[PDB]
Write a structure and sequence with these properties.
The structure is a homodimer. Helix content of chain A is 66%, strand content 2%. Chain A has helices at 35-46, 56-64, 67-95, 102-129, 133-142, 144-169, 186-220, 225-252, 259-267, 269-290, 301-317; strands at residues 173-176, 181-184. In chain A, strand 1 and strand 2 form a beta hairpin. A two-stranded antiparallel sheet of chain A has the order 1-2. Chain A is globular and about 60 Å long. By secondary structure, chain A is mainly alpha-helical. Chain A contains 11 helices and 2 strands. In chain A, helix 3 (67-95) packs across helix 5, helix 6 (144-169) runs antiparallel to helix 7 (186-220) and helix 7 packs across helix 9 (259-267). Bound molecules: mercury (II) ion (HG) (8 copies) and manganese (II) ion (MN) (4 copies). Residues 76, 210-211, 214, 290 of chain A line the site of one mercury (II) ion. One mercury (II) ion is lined by residues 265, 269, 272 of chain A. Chains A, B: Its cofactor is Fe cation. Chains A, B: Fe cation 2 binds at residues 115, 204, 238, 241.
């Protein structure tokens, strides 16, 4: 079972990142993988307050915008708000119960914490450029187009969480819950997790960047500059986040942390691969919705769609996987300005 | 079951703090209880970095100290490190899966986050005033005197967590896990939680303050002033934390949030009461250990023991309970200096 303070005096330097002995003492004078200590120190130094950024000038700009340019902006903001709504709570609930080294535990809490700040920044934008914030928030939940990907994201999480409870309550082996066979495999858990980790990596490394492009496009036209300033700070963070997930995944597949993982990584190769292809495809389809009533300067389907592929190829490379798309270059190199 | 993003478009202003629909959208443009929005804003504004505080001068002071004055200092630091080791992870794991209003969710993540910063500050002190930090950390786990209260604290948590898994996996009603009857009652969960909440309140409101007294005593003698500076920042935070737990408990017993709770609050009156008496007693016994080889100026058993009672009476008053002790005054009014 899970314990908020394991009684055993284990060597934290020799525990796996996951599934080992729950972390007891929170120490930071040493670590198994200092990338996590570095990320924490970096996240702490990037601390920023949303309320500070003046978005008052964005209300007029947003209003001026045509009903189809409002669609793009607000729709993209709604998606960002969704992602971080998830990410704020999710890494804590899903990963915290499985960490076994102190640096990763605290990194995840720091990481989740920073996502709540982003959520707040979104509330800061929305309530300052619209007269009925409730319309925006409620639609995030109802908007069936936002939910297509919203439901796919929370399943990897929900399923990992639910299967983690069984493991802590019953243990490995086959059980019966009210006349129902329920099998609990550690090798299966390590896979369920590996997939969330890979799915979380695509969310941080791809989903969010597709949103900064179709966000800074406005900043390029000198529109919504309060928002651009805020999303510049969020991108700096999401960069830390993707560095963390990338290190986790590459530490797992390298058998450096836990061989059984590495094995499950090679075996679960086509999934991890078709998992990304699914994500990229979902970001492209998203584009058809943002431009159903016309595009704008510097951003249309072909532009975005092309960025999705370019970006997806970059992210999978970082985790050793064949570029699912042609090997082209940045359709909007200007984006590097805001990053 | 628990979901990282509930599909239902509920009214977050009319959900109970706990056990209602998991929070979906993270919004901050309104809230059921703005005390939580206030705490978040306050915690965010108190953000501080431990590394900043120069504790270099504390190494000499600590060394100079007699072996019995080292006992006091280091033992008290070890206890603080334990508490925050727990608090860093615990509120997230135990409470996050049960919150149903956005402000409380984010407050808890902010609250847990701030505790990790405290853990770091402790690592910052320890590795700067001792030559073998490992000795200190390992003892936190082994030291059977630290574990007396360490085991009692993690049980309320562990038990609530474990019983929350069953509720999400099976639901209310009687079940059978491999030929074993297992009952899951919502009214029982609401109680298990109510007790952690009350036990967490004593940990923030009493346990931690007993440690600031037997910590600033050194600052009073112009010793360990780097540490005093750091613990001044931690106390400011623990004050926010106790304000939060106090509001939760008093919102629950007032039947304002959920009547069934209020009912379970009146019914579970002697426990909540004997729960505190147990804590206070544990802090007093702690004193016999800090002074087994002699006390120091401004701090001995009678002094401390008397503070424990004075403080305990203050905390229970704030949550409507009879002062378990005589109604006296502050045995060390100087402590208000550092707070
Ligand atoms: Hg996931
Ligand atoms: Hg976009
Ligand atoms: Hg893979
Ligand atoms: Hg394309
Ligand atoms: Hg508790
Ligand atoms: Hg003390
Ligand atoms: Hg009570
Ligand atoms: Hg006393
Ligand atoms: Mn974010
Ligand atoms: Mn992120
Ligand atoms: Mn603390
Ligand atoms: Mn606290």
């Amino acid at each position: 079972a899970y314990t908020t303070f394991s009684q055993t005096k284990n060597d934290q330097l020799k525990e796996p990142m996951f599934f080992g002995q729950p972390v007891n003492v929170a120490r930071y004078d040493q670590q198994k993988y200092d990338i996590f200590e570095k990320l924490i120190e970096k996240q702490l130094s990037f601390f920023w307050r949303p309320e500070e950024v003046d978005v008052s000038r964005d209300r007029i700009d947003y209003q001026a915008l045509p009903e189809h340019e409002k669609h793009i902006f607000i729709s993209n903001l709604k998606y960002q708000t969704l992602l971080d709504s998830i990410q704020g709570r999710s890494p804590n609930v899903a990963l915290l119960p499985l960490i076994s080294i102190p640096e990763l535990e605290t990194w995840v809490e720091t990481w989740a914490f920073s996502e709540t700040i982003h959520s707040r920044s979104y509330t800061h934008i929305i309530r300052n450029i619209v007269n009925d914030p409730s319309v925006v928030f409620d639609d995030i939940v109802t908007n069936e187009q936002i939910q297509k990907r919203a439901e796919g994201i929370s399943s990897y999480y929900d399923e990992l969480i639910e299967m983690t409870s069984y493991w802590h309550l019953l243990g490995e082996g086959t059980h019966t819950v009210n006349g129902k066979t329920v099998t609990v495999s550690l090798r299966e858990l390590k896979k369920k997790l590996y997939l969330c980790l890979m799915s979380v990596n695509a969310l941080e490394a791809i989903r969010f960047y597709v949103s900064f492009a179709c966000s800074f496009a406005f900043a390029e036209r000198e529109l919504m500059e309060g928002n651009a300033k805020i999303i510049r700070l969020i991108a700096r963070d999401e960069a830390l986040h993707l560095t963390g997930t990338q290190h986790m995944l590459n530490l797992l597949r390298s058998g450096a942390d836990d061989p059984e993982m590495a094995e499950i990584a090679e075996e679960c190769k086509q999934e991890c691969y078709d998992l990304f292809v699914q994500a990229a495809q979902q970001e492209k389809d998203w584009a058809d919705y943002l431009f159903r009533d016309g595009s704008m300067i510097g951003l249309n389907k072909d532009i975005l769609c092309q960025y999705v592929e370019y970006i997806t190829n970059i992210r999978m490379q970082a985790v050793g996987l064949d570029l699912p798309f042609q090997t082209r270059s940045n359709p909007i190199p200007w984006i590097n300005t805001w990053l």
